[PDB]
Structures are given as structure tokens and as C-alpha cells.
Design a protein around this ligand. Structure first.
Ligand SMILES: Cc1ccc(Cc2cc(=O)n3c(c2C2CC2)SC[C@H]3C(=O)O)c2ccccc12
Ligand SMILES: Cc1ccc(Cc2cc(=O)n3c(c2C2CC2)SC[C@H]3C(=O)O)c2ccccc12
Ligand code: NA
Ligand code: NA
Lengths: 229, 236
């Protein structure tokens, strides 16, 4: 995004520098009382919650460029006990204490609005995910995840649309009730495992079962959506 | 709500008058090419969608005071094909075209922050609902809906925590977001009643086992504590 590049310049102009993280690192964590604004510039992360018995809940995936805030902009207190875990091999992020951010959002309104609109994109993402699950259950969820991966990481090859992700990252994303759905899908030549990669061969099927996420992508990321429509 | 009362004052200072709506009216709709910022001041609404075959989907509930924006602040285009439907008898709202909300928030960062933090509360709300559904399924979803009803509208009495909402409105709200009046949800709710988690007495409803709701909606309970600590505190 150009809006993302301008935000990066704005931060680096104000002496906030990028930080590199490696896979499994927590950019912020649920036990930390200091809250942050993360500008995820590059890489893939997941928002988790860890219960007292140790079970890890995967709540949300984010890719750069995006903004993730662990605290409320006004109170500076936590919005939820969450970790931001790196799942790509490396990720680059700008890490801003929440108080320090208020100063900088204020001087510039273009950049205030860039962060505002990322929140709006998150809200409508969650509602669309929910709408697709209410209609089509787990098939909807899984079709939705494959759809966004196709739009974002897909590449045209003679074998279909290849999802061009490191095979290690694919494992981090989930690639017994899920086992059976992924089975039906290749069982119907919607997806295929060739060359140890992952190819989509019936993109219309994915659009059919994740209609509201498809609409979200159209409305919120139209230039990308347009590559495959 | 002090921050919201100040916002209302800021809108009237810039000449924006409130509008009144009635139950079943749409404050904004999915077909309108112009997108709006709604400052819901009083009353209860729901965000709805429609699928190809005409099925109404209830996505989200909102109560005054709150902000609901139908379009992106920068591009001014739709965030999704949604309607905002009034479900209380009446509702009062301020309706601002999206391009103007931008001037208004640029002129006063106190009010910018008020709206920004409204979005932050929505984001965290949806993640907590997701988490509770992941752990406890639809029972988690229903317990959380009743938990927030209790915190927001509940008043401690000798018979338990009375839900201070007319019986009409309050049965609709017992059904979490989804398809209206489903058999599965009606059974979950009546099971909670059979087990005396929420009970009918003298024309009113009383939550008598708040701990049970907290047990099955722990992440929405934490969300309310983090987002609305003074209201959470009153009943804990
Ligand atoms: C499988 C999958 C589904 C979902 C998202 C979320 C996403 C993706 C996305 O490309 N975008 C957004 C999100 C949601 C803000 C969160 S907001 C608009 C756009 C953007 O990034 O600018 C993924 C992100 C990373 C990796 C995998 C993901
Ligand atoms: C039963 C029930 C459960 C759930 C919500 C949602 C809610 C409620 C709520 O009280 N609040 C929020 C929400 C979700 C942002 C939307 S954000 C913080 C707080 C606030 O409004 O200030 C209700 C809203 C209206 C009526 C009933 C509701
Ligand atoms: Na934290
Ligand atoms: Na609209």
C-alpha cells in the first residue's frame, strides 16, 4: 500500500525504527502491562490467547502491512489478553508505546485516518467471517481461508493457482473434523497437492461457499480482488 | 456516559440535529450509495445482512451511546452490505455523511479518540465472541449474550439481578446474532431457565446464577471488564 509506505516514512522520520523478529517470537504478549501499537510492515503473524491449562487459541491472522493495537488509545489499558506471534520465518515491525503514539497520531491526520481505517477493516472482516460460518459452517470457514490465500499469495501456473507460501508457513496455518473437509475438497478437484506445493483449481467453488468474505475482499481490497475476477 | 455526552454536545455545536426512529426502521441500508456515520444516542439496534436467497442475518447489536460507520473513513465506500435496524420502540440518532465526520474529527482529537476507541471495543468484542464460541460453542455464545445483558441492564434486587428491559425487547435480545428464532437457540435459552440461571417472577426476569454465565463466557466477561470496568465492577 502507498498509505502503508507513507505511514512507514512518517514513523521513520520521527525516529521509530524497524525491528526484526523470527518465527515463534511474541511481538507483544498477554502478561505485559505495557501496551503497544504495532505497525506490522512485513511478515505473517497470529493473535493468540493462552489459557491457564496451556491451551493456545488462534484468534486472527495478520500480514504486513497492518496495524495491531494491544491497548485502547485513550486509557492505554489492555484490549484483551493477547499475544502477537510470528509465524513466517521473519517479520519486520515498528513497535510504539501506546502513550507515545497519541502524540504522533495527533500532529498528522492523514496517518490517524490510516490507522482508523485498519480498525474498520478488522471489524468488517470479523463480521464477514461470522456471516460465512453461520451459512456454511466449517466448509465456509475453510473456503474463506483458502480464498484469501489465493487472492493474496496465489500465482498462475499450469497446475492451477499455486499458493506461493513457504511450506513451513502453510503448516503454521493448518495445512479430524477439519481433516474430513480438506478431504472432500481435493476429492472434488477444488485443490490439489502437487510438487509438495498447494494449487487451487476451482476458484469459483471457494467464492461460492465464502460469499461474504469474498464481498469483504472486494470492498476492502479491490485492486487485489480484481486480479482474479 | 461522560465521553459520549461531550460528543453529543460537539455535534450540536456544529449544527447536527438528532433524528428519531421507530422499531423496524432502517437508519442506514445496504442499497444506498451514500455511506454514513451514525451516533446512536439512545435505543437499541441490530446490524443485518441478506444472502442471495433473501434470508435476514442478525450480525451485531448496538445500544446508545455508540458510533456505527457504514463506510470507510478514507475511501467513503461501504464496509459491507449492511442495514442498521431499530429494535427498541424508539431510537435517537445523529446521522452524518461520512465525508463530514472527517472534518469533525480532525478539528478535535478528544472526539477523534472517542470514536477510535469505539472501533477498538468492536474489534475486541468480536474476537472475544469468537474465542468463547471456540471453547463452548453456541452455549458460550448464548451465555455471553445474557452476560452482557445482565451487566448493562441488570439491577440487584432480593429476587436476583433484575433485567430492566421490557419483556418484548428482552426476548429478541436473548437470541445471539445469527438466524432469528432458531430451534437450537430457543432450547439453549429455555434450558438455562429450567436450571434457574434466569427465572421469571412477577412479570419480570431475574438472573439468579451470574457465576454460570461467567463460567461459559469467560472471554466476553474479560472483554467487558477491560472495556467497561466501572459497569463490570457494579455486579462483581
Ligand atoms: C488466511 C488469512 C485470512 C485473513 C487474513 C486477514 C487479512 C488479510 C488481508 O489481506 N487484509 C486484511 C486482513 C484482516 C485484518 C485482518 S485487512 C485488508 C487486507 C490487508 O492486509 O491490507 C490473513 C492475514 C494474513 C495471512 C493470512 C490471512
Ligand atoms: C445483549 C447484548 C450483547 C452485546 C451487545 C454489544 C455491546 C454492548 C455493550 O454494552 N458495549 C459494546 C457492545 C459491542 C460493540 C457492539 S462495546 C462497549 C459497550 C458499549 O456499548 O459502550 C449488546 C448491545 C446492545 C444491546 C444488547 C447487547
Ligand atoms: Na500486552
Ligand atoms: Na449503506
Amino acid at each position: 500500500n502507498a498509505q502503508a509506505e507513507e505511514f512507514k516514512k512518517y514513523l521513520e522520520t520521527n525516529g521509530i525504527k524497524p525491528k526484526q523478529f523470527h518465527k515463534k517470537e511474541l511481538i507483544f504478549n498477554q502478561w505485559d502491562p505495557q501496551e503497544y501499537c504495532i505497525f506490522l510492515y512485513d511478515g505473517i503473524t497470529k493473535l493468540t490467547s493462552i489459557s491457564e491449562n496451556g491451551t493456545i487459541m488462534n484468534l486472527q491472522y495478520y500480514k504486513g502491512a497492518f496495524v495491531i493495537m494491544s491497548g485502547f488509545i485513550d486509557t492505554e489499558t489492555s484490549v484483551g489478553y493477547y499475544n502477537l506471534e510470528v509465524i513466517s520465518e521473519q517479520a519486520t515491525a515498528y513497535v510504539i508505546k501506546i502513550n507515545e503514539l497519541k502524540e504522533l497520531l495527533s500532529k498528522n491526520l492523514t496517518h490517524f485516518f490510516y490507522v482508523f481505517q485498519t480498525l474498520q477493516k478488522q471489524v468488517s472482516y470479523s463480521l464477514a467471517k461470522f456471516n460465512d460460518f453461520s451459512i456454511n459452517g466449517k466448509l465456509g470457514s475453510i473456503c474463506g481461508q483458502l480464498l484469501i490465500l489465493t487472492y493474496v499469495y496465489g500465482k498462475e501456473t499450469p497446475d492451477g493457482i499455486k499458493i506461493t507460501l513457504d511450506n513451513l508457513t502453510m503448516q503454521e496455518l493448518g495445512y479430524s473434523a477439519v481433516s474430513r473437509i480438506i478431504s472432500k475438497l481435493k476429492q472434488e478437484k477444488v485443490i490439489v497437492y502437487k510438487n509438495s506445493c498447494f494449487y487451487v483449481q476451482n476458484l469459483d467453488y471457494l467464492k461460492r461457499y465464502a460469499p461474504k468474505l469474498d464481498e469483504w475482499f472486494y470492498l476492502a481490497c479491490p485492486a487485489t480482488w480484481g486480479k482474479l475476477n
